[PDB]
Amino acid sequence: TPLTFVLIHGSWATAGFWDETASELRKLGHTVYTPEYAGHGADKNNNVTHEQITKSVVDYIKQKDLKDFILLGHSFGGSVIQTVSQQVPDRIKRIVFFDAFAPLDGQSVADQFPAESLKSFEQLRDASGNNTITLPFPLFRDTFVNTASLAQAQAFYKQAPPEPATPLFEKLDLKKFYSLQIPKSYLYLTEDTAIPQGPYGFHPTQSSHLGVFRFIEGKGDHMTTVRTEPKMMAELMVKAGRD
């Protein structure tokens, strides 16, 4: 039966992250929205806050008056789907975390990282002199697009803009999110190393934050597979999103 998806990209990404996978979901007959949000894409605001990002997504949903949809977030987008779901819970059928962070109440996204990764991100933020984090291409190539060829890694890095740092480090009040009875799914790709696998990995550590959820597993990494295997990704998003 037809589904409506609202897809929320994460850091070092734009709404164009979803171009190939959103096309394949539409070919299955689903309706797909891929909003851009504050401080990202064409909105230049290196001092953007988590609440400004959240407001930009809630305003997009309200302006289209969307109801009964699957809210899906990737990476830092997991924190966005949590804060958006607190504001429009009546509109959401299911919340899907796709290789996404799920901070606990009183935590930031940065709080999810191992000590060495936290240090690296603070250093990148401070090096910029403009409150942004530019991923080094060697780190990107070997931990974000590990399964890509070099030519693919270089093409995808062109679409990985510097990230405004404030929303990664803000502590979030997620008491409302953790009270919601909306069903949750976690869609995990087994080569995703954007956060190192082990005690801090996306799965089972981040996914376990959701409590009861529907686990769907696939093959891929953080940023290659939505471009290279969009049919398979569309099918996994349906398996995670469907009733």
Place this chain on the structure above:
Amino acid sequence: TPLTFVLIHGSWATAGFWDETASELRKLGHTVYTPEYAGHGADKNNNVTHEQITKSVVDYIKQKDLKDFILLGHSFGGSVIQTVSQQVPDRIKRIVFFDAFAPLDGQSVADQFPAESLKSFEQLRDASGNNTITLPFPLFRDTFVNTASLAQAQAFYKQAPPEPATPLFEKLDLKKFYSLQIPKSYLYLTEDTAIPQGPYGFHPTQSSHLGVFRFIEGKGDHMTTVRTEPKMMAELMVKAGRD
């Protein structure tokens, strides 16, 4: 080489759990027994004990004089293959744990769960007023049959009867099992979340209780895959059961 399997279902299930997969094993030339056990199937006994279940399976094995067989258990059935193997060790070629619990000596099946799940099962047992646990459908749909469609999930839920609770909470004496020299295997499906993945999960946590064993991995979940992909499951059970 042809194999003889004795397949032991787990909780919220009957011998009918094995219908499709047993049929595919028989097409490969294997002999397959799927006994029912005390307080399950048509045998109504809300107060059944682990000893009564174990004796019903031992009596089935003795009455058919079964020997040189692969004793395979799913879920709670792992505890039953342990206690059965204590009484008929000379009859068993290999013991296969398929997404199954393997309590240590002095532990129950319920002891293997995270604290939150254990409390939830105690609450369901108490709410029944008749010593049974009925899985709620949202929990079942999202954590027992997470890879199924909703229509499949509903069909499988209709085949998941309430479970007599005593055997899940009894402490088991398993000293004999842990002294046995019989070869073991663990067959794991990587989307099985009937116990949450993480520190309490089926693999590597439950499987590690076996000590030295043969690990075999497949794709699937707790209760969909034996119905939807029975040929693939039969092949996995041969890979886990063969010499």
Place this chain on the structure above:
Amino acid sequence: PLTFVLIHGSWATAGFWDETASELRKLGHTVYTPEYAGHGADKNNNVTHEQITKSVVDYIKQKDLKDFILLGHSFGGSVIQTVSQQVPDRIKRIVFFDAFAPLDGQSVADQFPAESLKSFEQLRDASGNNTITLPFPLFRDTFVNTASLAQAQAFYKQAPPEPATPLFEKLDLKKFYSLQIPKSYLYLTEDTAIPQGPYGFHPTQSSHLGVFRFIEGKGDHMTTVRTEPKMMAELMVKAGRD
């Protein structure tokens, strides 16, 4: 086109790579599979880690190899560590394939669960000639768990007893841990030669590398390089390529 130097582990010879090396060459890559001290033809049950390391360095220098991918399996992960710190100018990338990566001042045996360490010390001592012969049941269910019995019996005959000293020697790896050469870890998800859990190849051994490229495949410790060499060659290119 890539150049690979493949380093086998314990209970193996350079012939471990025959099938996978052939498939890599059909993809257009150049592939070297050196033998090392105390393994293959070289009968030396008292060989040391330094002797093994020097035999591989000597091979690389004599052939004047450069700009190559240095890949090790199992105990061979310790060998690519010690080799790479001698010839870092020659190496493009270091690939650990279901391999040990001891930290500085550790041995390979230090990676093992306590009960495995005691067992290996006992097998070494029982030999009377400083070798370790794996018992066939342990081999059959934990090294070639995905093989048939007939395949396991054939592979066991190609698994010679291991000279024990290099497994137990502590390694000076300060230079290896200071290198900026990129690292990859190639992991097969049914590899149980060290049990999965806190002691497993991935994420425990792989975590020792710091930042690395993770590539995952399907297979076990010693079956898959024989039975699925085309797939293993593809994974080695995914792990080794720029």
